[PDB]
Design a protein around this ligand. Structure first.
Ligand SMILES: Cc1cc2c(cc1C)N(C[C@H](O)[C@H](O)[C@H](O)COP(=O)(O)OP(=O)(O)OC[C@H]1O[C@@H](n3cnc4c(N)ncnc43)[C@H](O)[C@@H]1O)c1[nH]c(=O)[nH]c(=O)c1N2
Ligand SMILES: Cc1cc2c(cc1C)N(C[C@H](O)[C@H](O)[C@H](O)COP(=O)(O)OP(=O)(O)OC[C@H]1O[C@@H](n3cnc4c(N)ncnc43)[C@H](O)[C@@H]1O)c1[nH]c(=O)[nH]c(=O)c1N2
Ligand SMILES: Cc1cc2c(cc1C)N(C[C@H](O)[C@H](O)[C@H](O)COP(=O)(O)OP(=O)(O)OC[C@H]1O[C@@H](n3cnc4c(N)ncnc43)[C@H](O)[C@@H]1O)c1[nH]c(=O)[nH]c(=O)c1N2
Ligand SMILES: Cc1cc2c(cc1C)N(C[C@H](O)[C@H](O)[C@H](O)COP(=O)(O)OP(=O)(O)OC[C@H]1O[C@@H](n3cnc4c(N)ncnc43)[C@H](O)[C@@H]1O)c1[nH]c(=O)[nH]c(=O)c1N2
Ligand SMILES: O=c1ccn([C@H]2C[C@H](O)[C@@H](COP(=O)(O)O)O2)c(=O)[nH]1
Ligand SMILES: O=c1ccn([C@H]2C[C@H](O)[C@@H](COP(=O)(O)O)O2)c(=O)[nH]1
Ligand SMILES: O=c1ccn([C@H]2C[C@H](O)[C@@H](COP(=O)(O)O)O2)c(=O)[nH]1
Ligand SMILES: O=c1ccn([C@H]2C[C@H](O)[C@@H](COP(=O)(O)O)O2)c(=O)[nH]1
Lengths: 220, 220, 213, 220
């Protein structure tokens, strides 16, 4: 159970895993009517599959994560269809006062007419007003599913994500990359760390031969 | 195939952009099993009914639709959970968003005893979206990148997307969303999807309602 | 270790599993009696997505005509033995005379078994001849019959596995794949008793699992 | 309907299509709250999407094919899960005397101890014996689903294939390549021709920037 904190209140937590590097090896070797051999040959096979684009053996390694993220990050995340999701419902749950407030450092490198600290304050102010309106509508008898429509996109949500290593590697190619929004790159970095810990050979081979993004080769 | 269009909520819509196939596409795909093709209207319509009541669903995957939908983000989040489909949506990271939000009418609260008049709930919702949208424009004008500025925008912000889906996945969508358990707002969009489906595939739609449809609102 | 022999030379073997009945509870909720009650509630009302968080990996040995029907289940992962790169073994499914008893045949079922065995022997011999003569494996194997045994790894979640059971653990499916589906059901019941029991009770569409223990 | 003969008795036939190059342009432009512009800018956008790996807009172009192929080719083909299939059933149909007999030219480049013409004869001989046994079991009352198990892997089958341009391009990367079996390369070349005819800009851009195989850059 590895847990990595992301942003001001979010996290990525490993809930469960099926298999390891040898799961991909065993699945690849069935093609030749073979099974496992030895650490050197098996690790060499992992590198071979990654170098030649033999991706299907990696589908037999599966992960389950527990993620707490702002809704704008979850909307980008939930576009990855080759995976399983189960999320907190704003129709049935009374939502908590938990929102992503960017730190002033998030606006570094941008020439802004107002200080980054003031942008942080303006964002906090609007979430405070929206959350107060939400509670007022709830207390006045407005059904939850309608009252929440005033809540901003930085509202924190929670979800379970079940994904295989092949789809997870596609997620890393697209999200652990400077073109993805900074907030989701941070989440992808945490996914990469858990992946590296559970599948060191696959992760190392992935970075070496198949990884298409840019930030995982620069950030340890 | 031409541009069917149904207005939903205050500013949304469901528009038919394109379609591939019709009832006979499912007939031709089912008949290949027996080394046959089309026969006649009576036998082919009887085959559609047979397929539907027996759960032979794969022939219906050969009928495909493309829709153009304008919907509030809370509706799009529920909709985008349907993984067996294709999506392409408006980006808040790259587009300067328009002043278009879903403001529920007072009638949306009918059947709920509220401490404040429904008209005042409508006003409170309009007020908070006005404040959030104004803050969003302020941050944009001050040089804050769009992908950060938009995080203060509420869940009733209108978004636009293209949805490509086959009749099998569309029928699953209708079972789940054209039903009283789904949120009222997405039921309205599902009624529009069913209306288009009925027009393009009358035999499939009629057989679906008659033997496989699991929801409750289409039969009323 | 769970391994069940199927047909004359096939099998279904459990290689790995992720999660159990509580994985579907942990996924839905975002106590034994309350959690079983929740599983039954999810199955009864068609809340299927929490069951996608339970995953299985099987190792299956089956005739190619069975594998062709099996591989139609797209929502799963496969990795199979290659006839292009492997020299195939003399392993074919020969139906026993009991497979045909129930059909009025003009020749005894034992003779049908013999005719099938004879033609697979001739095909396999031709295959070895072409291999020995330098014909590439991928071409030489095209003479081998549909009852040739193949081996594969199958990674599937409980939701797609339940769809597989609805369709294959049913009298409309071919008898041969029903036998594999019964073995899949046995392992699934052992690892997820509450989910399997709730599935049989409220969502199972087939007929043979309610009759066969 | 565009029909291309493959092998001795096989074919690839275009049954239906939804959309064209402009479908992808339209789906990509929603990101910027835009639609179509002009031929030069819209074709430039297709090239841009292919060059930077923006693949999802191409999912909105869908094709339906009617293919006749040997079962060993169909087994490799049916591994492409992101698609729809409906095939001839050996359980319910009395199968025809239609088998793939390789020509002597198929064995060119391989040093064989027996002439290629003799390999062709040996293959024909064993299919003749197997087909005769199949008919005798059928005539004796053996159910079709059992009688067919003696039929060899070169037996011709027929199927409908519904696939979008993104999954079709994945199919071309893997099957229109020298690593794939020669027989399925012949089918992939026919798929490529129909794709080029219906989506010239997408096909041209695909070959230019995203195509991973080798034979489509050599063969017109
Ligand atoms: C930087 C950046 C910018 C954007 C976007 C992403 C990124 C990283 N996206 C999101 C993008 O369109 C896409 O939805 C996600 O990145 C998921 O990518 P996959 O489809 O590869 O993942 P997913 O997990 O859904 O699929 C994994 C793989 O399966 C295959 N696949 C799955 N379903 C398929 C199907 N139905 N047909 C064919 N192949 C299928 C593909 O091979 C895919 O790579 C986007 N989106 C948007 O709408 N507007 C935008 O402006 C942007 N902008
Ligand atoms: C009234 C109501 C209430 C809720 C919800 C829905 C509705 C209608 N949901 C959403 C729900 O869990 C689900 O995501 C959507 O209904 C999409 O359903 P499908 O998976 O059937 O569609 P989708 O299009 O994703 O799949 C279509 C079909 O493909 C199959 N399928 C696709 N992907 C699969 C996979 N990976 N494994 C196995 N089979 C797969 C299944 O057969 C499925 O029926 C939910 N969600 C949530 O997180 N929290 C909640 O509280 C709620 N509440
Ligand atoms: C008794 C019997 C008889 C036959 C057949 C099956 C059985 C049980 N079949 C095979 C059948 O058409 C089908 O291919 C398999 O049963 C796989 O079933 P699913 O598609 O449900 O599983 P699969 O694993 O492919 O999908 C699981 C679920 O995800 C969803 N799904 C997955 N992919 C989808 C997609 N592309 N579009 C929409 N939804 C999608 C559906 O909800 C589906 O139930 C067949 N086949 C044939 O070609 N000819 C035949 O004559 C027969 N006969
Ligand atoms: C030359 C050659 C040689 C071989 C093989 C292929 C080729 C081209 N294969 C087949 C291979 O393993 C694979 O099944 C097919 O190429 C289908 O490829 P996709 O998964 O890309 O297509 P498919 O159409 O199924 O999927 C398209 C895309 O969707 C995504 N995808 C779909 N389902 C997914 C899932 N469940 N998890 C993650 N991502 C998913 C991926 O991004 C994928 O590229 C093989 N097979 C074998 O078993 N033994 C062998 O020896 C060989 N040998
Ligand atoms: O009727 C519902 C309720 C929930 N969800 C999904 C969408 C989100 O991913 C998550 C929470 O949605 P809300 O309940 O907050 O709308 O569950 C739906 O698809 N439909
Ligand atoms: O980097 C991006 C940009 C967009 N999208 C998807 C998510 C939404 O479905 C839609 C718009 O996202 P925003 O650009 O508004 O974040 O496109 C992503 O997945 N990643
Ligand atoms: O019971 C059946 C019948 C057919 N099919 C699929 C598998 C093949 O793709 C095709 C023909 O299979 P046979 O009927 O020849 O076994 O249809 C099944 O999956 N199950
Ligand atoms: O080039 C290949 C080799 C294998 N496979 C898949 C198809 C079968 O499921 C299995 C074995 O195919 P053969 O190598 O026996 O043709 O792997 C392919 O799709 N393409």
């Amino acid at each position: 159970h590895m847990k990595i904190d992301i942003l001001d209140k979010g996290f990525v937590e490993l809930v469960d895993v099926m298999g390891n590097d040898l799961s991909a090896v065993r699945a690849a070797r069935v093609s030749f009517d073979m099974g496992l051999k030895d650490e050197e040959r098996d690790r060499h096979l992992i590198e071979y599959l990654m170098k030649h684009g033999h991706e299907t053996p990696f589908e037999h390694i599966v992960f389950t994560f527990h993620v707490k993220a702002p809704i704008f990050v979850a909307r980008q995340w939930f576009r990855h269809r080759i995976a399983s999701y189960n999320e907190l419902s704003g129709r049935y749950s009374k939502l908590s006062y938990e929102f992503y407030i960017p730190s002033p450092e998030r606006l570094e490198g941008y020439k802004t007419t107002i200080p980054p600290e003031r942008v942080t304050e303006k964002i906090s102010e609007i979430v405070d007003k929206a959350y107060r309106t939400y509670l007022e509508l709830i207390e006045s008898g407005v059904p939850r599913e309608v009252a929440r429509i005033v809540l901003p996109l930085n509202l924190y949500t929670r979800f379970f994500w079940t994904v295989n290593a092949r789809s997870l590697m596609n997620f890393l190619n697209l999200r652990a990359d400077s073109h993805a929004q900074w907030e989701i790159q941070q989440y992808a970095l945490a996914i990469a760390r858990i992946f590296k810990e559970k599948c060191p050979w696959t992760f190392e081979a992935f970075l070496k031969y198949a990884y298409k993004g840019d930030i995982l080769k620069e950030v340890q």
